[PDB]
Paper text:
For the ease of aerosol formulation, we sought to increase the stability of the engineered inhibitors. Four variants with additional disulfide bonds stapling the N and C terminus had considerably increased thermostability, and bound to αvβ6 with subnanomolar affinity; mutation of the RGD to KGE abrogated binding to αvβ6 confirming that the RGD loop is necessary for binding. For αvβ6 integrin, B6_BP_dslf had the lowest IC50 (1.84 nM), followed by B6B8_BP_dslf (3.79 nM), PLN-74809 (4.36 nM); B8_BP_dslf had no detectable binding consistent with its very high selectivity. Taken together, these data confirm that B6_BP_dslf and B8_BP_dslf have exquisite selectivity and affinity for their respective integrin targets, with considerably greater RGD integrin selectivity than the small molecules PLN-74809 and GSK3008348. We also characterized the pharmacokinetics of B6_BP_dslf in the lungs and serum of healthy male C57BL/6 mice following a single dose via different routes of administration. B6_BP_dslf was rapidly cleared from the blood following IV and IP administration with a half-life of ~10 min, and following inhaled administration, B6_BP_dslf had a half-life in the lungs of ~1 h. The properties of B6_BP_dslf are unchanged following aerosolization: the protein is monomeric, thermostable, has the same CD spectrum, and binds to αvβ6 with similar affinity. In addition to the highly potent anti-fibrotic effects demonstrated here in the bleomycin-induced lung fibrosis model, the reduced systemic exposure due to the short serum half-life (~10 min), high selectivity and affinity for αvβ6, stabilization of the open αvβ6 conformation, ease of production using E. coli, hyper-thermostability, and aerosol formulatability give B6_BP_dslf an improved target product profile as a therapeutic candidate for IPF.
Numbering used by the authors: 0 to 74
The structure:
């Protein structure tokens, strides 16, 4: 089945706080998800998720943290 990577890049004075708040939310709904942090705690990478969930979590973060950069790549 298709699997996807989603990358969130937070910018600004609260970027690291935003990343951790979002990571907490995603781990609550996907405790088994492969979620790691890069770019000095400003980039959040979620690996190996279904396309339906990648789009849903993309829309969730963009609605609430509009200044985030969101990239989704599926396989």
């Amino acid at each position: 089945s298709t699997k996807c990577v989603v990358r969130f890049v937070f910018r600004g004075d609260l970027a690291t706080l935003m990343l951790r708040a979002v990571k907490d939310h995603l781990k609550k709904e996907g405790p088994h998800w492969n979620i790691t942090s890069t770019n000095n705690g400003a980039e959040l990478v979620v690996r190996g998720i279904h396309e339906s969930d990648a789009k849903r979590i993309a829309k969730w973060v963009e609605k609430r943290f509009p200044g985030v950069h969101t990239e989704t790549q599926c396989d």
